[PDB]
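so i finally got all the pieces together for this one. its three components total, 699 residues if u count the protein bits. some of the lines might not be protein, just check the labels. i wanna see the whole assembly predicted at once instead of chain by chain like last time, that was a mess tbh
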Amino acid sequence: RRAACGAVLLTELLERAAFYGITSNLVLFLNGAPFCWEGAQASEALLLFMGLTYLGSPFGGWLADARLGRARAILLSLALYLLGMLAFPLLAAPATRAALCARCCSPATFAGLVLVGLGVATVKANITPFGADQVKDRGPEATRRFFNWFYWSINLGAILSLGGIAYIQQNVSFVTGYAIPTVCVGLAFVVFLCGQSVFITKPPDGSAFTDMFKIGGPFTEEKVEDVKALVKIVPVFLALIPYWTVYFQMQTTYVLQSLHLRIPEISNITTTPHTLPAAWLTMFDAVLILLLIPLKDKLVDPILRRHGLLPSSLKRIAVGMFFVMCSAFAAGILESKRLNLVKEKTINQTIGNVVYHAADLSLWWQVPQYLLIGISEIFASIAGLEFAYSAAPKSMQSAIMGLFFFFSGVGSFVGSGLLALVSIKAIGWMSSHTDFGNINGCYLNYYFFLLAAIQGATLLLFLIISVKYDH
Amino acid sequence: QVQLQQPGTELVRPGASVKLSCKASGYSFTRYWMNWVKQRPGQGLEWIGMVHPSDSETRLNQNFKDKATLTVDKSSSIAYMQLSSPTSEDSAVYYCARWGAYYKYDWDYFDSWGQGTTLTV
Amino acid sequence: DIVMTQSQKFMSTSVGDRVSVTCKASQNVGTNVVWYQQKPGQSPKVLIYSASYRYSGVPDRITGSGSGTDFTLTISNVQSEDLAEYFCQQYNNFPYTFGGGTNLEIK
């Protein structure tokens, strides 16, 4: 059906818009007055919120696969999402802040962050297998097409969020900049409630985990084959962890390098009365993916299916890993050229309210290093979801998807730890980032080459593991 | 030892062309932005253009467009600023400030200034 | 064009007293304000960058504070040397705009 497959895409779009409207300007929301949070306290709060969104995903999937069902768990998680989102407009508005109020407004904002984190975790764990279930009966090709358009909806929600919500948050107001994500969560909940009349709902199977927890025999063939498939999908999820570290380090270091390239400032919208948000620099990957997914689904996918190339999702993940390694190499080359450039010519450009010291190198020189990563998310990301759905046992698809997102979060935190590791004085690749705040003295080229080497090793290991998985 | 030598009095006639000079010495000339500031006798400072003496990329002030023209002679390590047709309100003390900010150093202040050339018309 | 208003043109202070010159930016400049000290018949000398820091050689009595719209340069141990016009410059947006200038009138 197209009504259910449109309702799922729309509610995922709204959920992603709300999530990116929260994360994009959360640190600066707490740092700025009247919250007056410390320099690292807001970053710690954001890190805790993201870690919650990643850690609650397997439990959010277990809740939908054992107790509530996939359809009802998304409704409950969106209700919790909206309840936790309501704190941010309430806190930002000074008329309603008195009711709510590691700082003066710590409890209300931390309760909101916890609720939004749990809501994001459960929605992410449950809505993509629930979305796939609508066209599951039409074959694996229909599931792949739905995952293409699901990632397109995710990235369109990211585009709308980081473009409008972030701009309104920074240059208009934080009351009407944070009210729109709450309205987005409300609209997602309303859309899901309306589409419940057309959704295909699989009843929960509470005992399905119990057998998996326990291990002719005492158990049926299906309940032991579920464990046999889980113990085969766990190594593949583990092998994707370094890919997650590399990719989540791209998502940060590419923005860091963007800020230190000559961003073409707009004299109309981003002129002196307003500011250029730093989320617009994170928006480039989603901008490219918006144009790449329709090309993949309408042109690349039919050709690859006609000629039979890359039928398995693991091979697609492998080619995505290769493309993200190529993106790391291109970023390293561009950063070497940039660090050569910023020795005799450094310009000042203001992003938000921070005066970064860029080189005389156009920001669009990140197009070759972003297009490649975009292609990576065309292959490595979307197919990952497919492998998290196709290879999951029929009774614990939400749990396996939540575990896939939890391992994505484990990779993200391992990448944060690796960035902190290369920041030590012993290595010093990114050590000169806190004294002055610019990567002009930081060896980000060496870090990008390290990410490329890590991704090459990960691609080799993943080729081995994918060959073993398909025998 | 960063010295931005300035000539001093620059008496001229209205409608002429004025080329204030600033000899930058004691430092690598072609790595820091050389800005020009104008202080009227009874007003505050007015930042009027910057030039990077490596590409001569002049980021002029909009109020001082078509008035000021920032040039650089890299051979003699001098920064010139030319006023075209200076009227009676162009008489002021023009400082040639440096801008202390470059590779790895986010200092972001005017650092070393010139003695200021007192343009009188 | 951030009109960087220093509403108090003249501050009268005494030796050993404390004077806090103020500077209200037109927009949210951020920690992007430099305080200069133009002594009589001299070019301005950078006193405090980033609105809270201290240039090398500042006698540490001249502290800086503020962020966003409002900034403040406080001298808590005014000597006879601090007889100068204090200029509040923003480098957050182009063109760079200075304050109207505040000069200490030591009495």
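DSSP finds 18 helices and two strands in chain A.
The beta strands of chain A are 346-351, 354-359.
anyway lmk what u think
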